[PDB]
Design a protein around this motif. Structure first.
Motif, PDB file in Angstrom:
ATOM      1  N   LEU B  47       0.844  -1.185   0.000  1.00 53.28           N
ATOM      2  CA  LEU B  47       0.000   0.000   0.000  1.00 53.28           C
ATOM      3  C   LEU B  47       0.883   1.240   0.000  1.00 53.28           C
ATOM      4  O   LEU B  47       1.800   1.358   0.819  1.00 53.28           O
ATOM      5  CB  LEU B  47      -0.932   0.010   1.214  1.00 53.28           C
ATOM      6  N   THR B  48       0.610   2.163  -0.916  1.00 51.87           N
ATOM      7  CA  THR B  48       1.422   3.360  -1.057  1.00 51.87           C
ATOM      8  C   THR B  48       0.518   4.551  -1.330  1.00 51.87           C
ATOM      9  O   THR B  48      -0.626   4.403  -1.761  1.00 51.87           O
ATOM     10  CB  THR B  48       2.458   3.212  -2.178  1.00 51.87           C
ATOM     11  N   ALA B  49       1.051   5.744  -1.073  1.00 51.31           N
ATOM     12  CA  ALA B  49       0.305   6.979  -1.260  1.00 51.31           C
ATOM     13  C   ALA B  49       1.231   8.055  -1.803  1.00 51.31           C
ATOM     14  O   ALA B  49       2.333   8.255  -1.288  1.00 51.31           O
ATOM     15  CB  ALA B  49      -0.335   7.450   0.050  1.00 51.31           C
ATOM     16  N   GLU B  50       0.772   8.743  -2.843  1.00 51.70           N
ATOM     17  CA  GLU B  50       1.542   9.833  -3.420  1.00 51.70           C
ATOM     18  C   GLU B  50       1.485  11.059  -2.516  1.00 51.70           C
ATOM     19  O   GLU B  50       0.454  11.369  -1.915  1.00 51.70           O
ATOM     20  CB  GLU B  50       1.012  10.172  -4.815  1.00 51.70           C
ATOM     21  N   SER B  51       2.612  11.758  -2.419  1.00 49.23           N
ATOM     22  CA  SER B  51       2.734  12.935  -1.572  1.00 49.23           C
ATOM     23  C   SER B  51       2.364  14.180  -2.365  1.00 49.23           C
ATOM     24  O   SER B  51       2.808  14.350  -3.505  1.00 49.23           O
ATOM     25  CB  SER B  51       4.157  13.064  -1.024  1.00 49.23           C
ATOM     26  N   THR B  65      10.499  21.818   5.116  1.00 46.45           N
ATOM     27  CA  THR B  65       9.485  21.521   4.116  1.00 46.45           C
ATOM     28  C   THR B  65       8.406  20.615   4.694  1.00 46.45           C
ATOM     29  O   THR B  65       8.665  19.785   5.570  1.00 46.45           O
ATOM     30  CB  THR B  65      10.109  20.854   2.890  1.00 46.45           C
ATOM     31  N   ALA B  66       7.186  20.780   4.188  1.00 43.75           N
ATOM     32  CA  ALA B  66       6.041  19.999   4.629  1.00 43.75           C
ATOM     33  C   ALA B  66       5.266  19.491   3.422  1.00 43.75           C
ATOM     34  O   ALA B  66       5.226  20.136   2.371  1.00 43.75           O
ATOM     35  CB  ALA B  66       5.116  20.820   5.536  1.00 43.75           C
ATOM     36  N   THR B  67       4.645  18.325   3.588  1.00 41.14           N
ATOM     37  CA  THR B  67       3.856  17.690   2.542  1.00 41.14           C
ATOM     38  C   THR B  67       2.653  17.016   3.190  1.00 41.14           C
ATOM     39  O   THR B  67       2.438  17.118   4.401  1.00 41.14           O
ATOM     40  CB  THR B  67       4.695  16.684   1.746  1.00 41.14           C
ATOM     41  N   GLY B  68       1.858  16.324   2.377  1.00 38.69           N
ATOM     42  CA  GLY B  68       0.703  15.617   2.898  1.00 38.69           C
ATOM     43  C   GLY B  68       0.378  14.391   2.072  1.00 38.69           C
ATOM     44  O   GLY B  68       0.836  14.240   0.933  1.00 38.69           O
ATOM     45  N   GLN B  69      -0.427  13.513   2.665  1.00 32.32           N
ATOM     46  CA  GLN B  69      -0.835  12.288   1.993  1.00 32.32           C
ATOM     47  C   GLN B  69      -1.879  12.595   0.926  1.00 32.32           C
ATOM     48  O   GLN B  69      -2.848  13.318   1.180  1.00 32.32           O
ATOM     49  CB  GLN B  69      -1.385  11.290   3.012  1.00 32.32           C
ATOM     50  N   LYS B  72      -4.026   7.112  -2.561  1.00 34.56           N
ATOM     51  CA  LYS B  72      -3.496   5.802  -2.222  1.00 34.56           C
ATOM     52  C   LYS B  72      -3.550   4.865  -3.422  1.00 34.56           C
ATOM     53  O   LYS B  72      -4.363   5.035  -4.335  1.00 34.56           O
ATOM     54  CB  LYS B  72      -4.271   5.190  -1.054  1.00 34.56           C
TER      55      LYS B  72
END
Lengths: 243, 243
Positions: B47-51, B65-69, B72
């Motif tokens: 299971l993977t999710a692009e940022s 730096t900041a990112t988010g989910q 999926k």
């Protein structure tokens, strides 16, 4: 436990925040943290930094190129642990992945120091094979700024929780506060929690170094106080008078 | 078959849905499922999710730096079995690959829990070598929301916690056993820990639902046992005798 000497590394633990307060304020506390058990292996995040060019034509002796530090990144933290679908902590992990909210997770090194990041789960996997334990592998992408283990560096702790005993008479909707204190004159990284032993005669509303009790029924019951991780405890009795 | 403990992974089976009803409803039933026997190797999709970037120009603390989910994905699940073309189920797998319609496949682990995914076959290979069995390698690219195992887990808890009181017989090293049991219908998540309130007259040796309590110096110690739920607690009274 000497944080000024090299440590073998064994016994490292991993915890995930689940409370509502400030994770960075009290990281040594283990009250609102759930431990992920049987971590097969763990590789923490890496602090990187993109570079920016800082060389202009006006500068003399331009034979050498120069760069400066720009934005820093907290990297990705990976860890594989034994796969127990029915154990609390893994269910919370998959709930965290399915939702995607940014949560705090900390690593307790065998050194008396902790290291807490904030991030979200970016990868979930599994490695099923015969003659070997099934391992679930998780990858977390960190966001914001982490709280390094070299920041606090000034932990303090001594022996004891002082608490005033007795406190017999309890009237007027009860609701009396009883004084608690620590032994090292108060100056430490504090943590504690308390709750009534029966909950049918009285209950507690612990909030901010003061333990306030309010009772519903008569009887004798003793409330305990546990120091966060629980390296100390105390007991104080309550006898609810009829009138 | 305890889902709260690690397992050896040996004996994991694979099934492919063949019926017409919803596979996601009752994946514990083997009614409309066809077994793919003689599995050599298996590797479930991760299971993977692009940022997605979550950095704003007007916010403070720009040093990190900041990112988010984001979105999926269910990954690609691979498995290599033995080549037995005349066996039904391999022909069904080849027909599934030829038609290329999305279908469901489940994996039965030696815990009682299942892993049911939905996807389409995207690769078919073969490895013919002398002094070895001819193997058929299949790879399925998964789509939609996979039904993880942790979605089949139910939690039973609360209703309090119990421990035997007094037992004032404390003499000659003790190591007395103290039993902590939970009332609600046997089944529960028994997370707990107990702490000595004095650490000198007596001490505790918490070990897997059994408290080992020893005495060192004569006196009166009341030791509390609390739980990770944060509501349940009790206090047991001990009188360590000099002789």
């Amino acid at each position: 436990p000497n944080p000024t000497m090299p440590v073998k590394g064994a016994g490292t633990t991993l915890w995930v925040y689940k409370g509502s307060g400030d994770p960075y304020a009290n990281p040594l506390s283990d009250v609102d943290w759930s431990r992920l058990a049987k971590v097969k292996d763990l590789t923490p995040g890496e602090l990187t930094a993109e570079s920016y060019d800082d060389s202009y034509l006006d500068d003399e002796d331009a034979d050498w190129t120069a760069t400066g530090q720009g934005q820093k990144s907290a990297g990705d933290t990976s860890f594989t642990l034994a796969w127990m679908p029915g154990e609390q902590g893994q269910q919370a992990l998959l709930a965290w992945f399915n939702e995607g909210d940014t949560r705090a997770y900390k690593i307790r090194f065998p050194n008396g120091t902790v290291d807490v990041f904030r991030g979200w789960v970016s990868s979930i996997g599994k490695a099923v094979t015969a003659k070997e334990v099934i391992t679930r592998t998780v990858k977390v992408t960190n966001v914001g700024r982490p709280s390094m283990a070299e920041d606090r560096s000034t932990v303090t702790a001594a022996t004891g929780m002082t608490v005033t005993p007795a406190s017999t008479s309890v009237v007027k909707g009860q609701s009396t506060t009883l004084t608690v204190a620590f032994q090292p004159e108060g100056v430490t990284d504090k943590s504690f929690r308390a709750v009534s032993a029966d909950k049918t005669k009285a209950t507690v509303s612990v909030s901010g170094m003061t333990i306030t009790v309010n009772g519903v029924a008569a009887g004798k019951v003793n409330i305990p106080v546990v120091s966060g991780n629980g390296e100390f405890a105390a007991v104080a009795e309550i006898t609810v008078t009829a009138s």
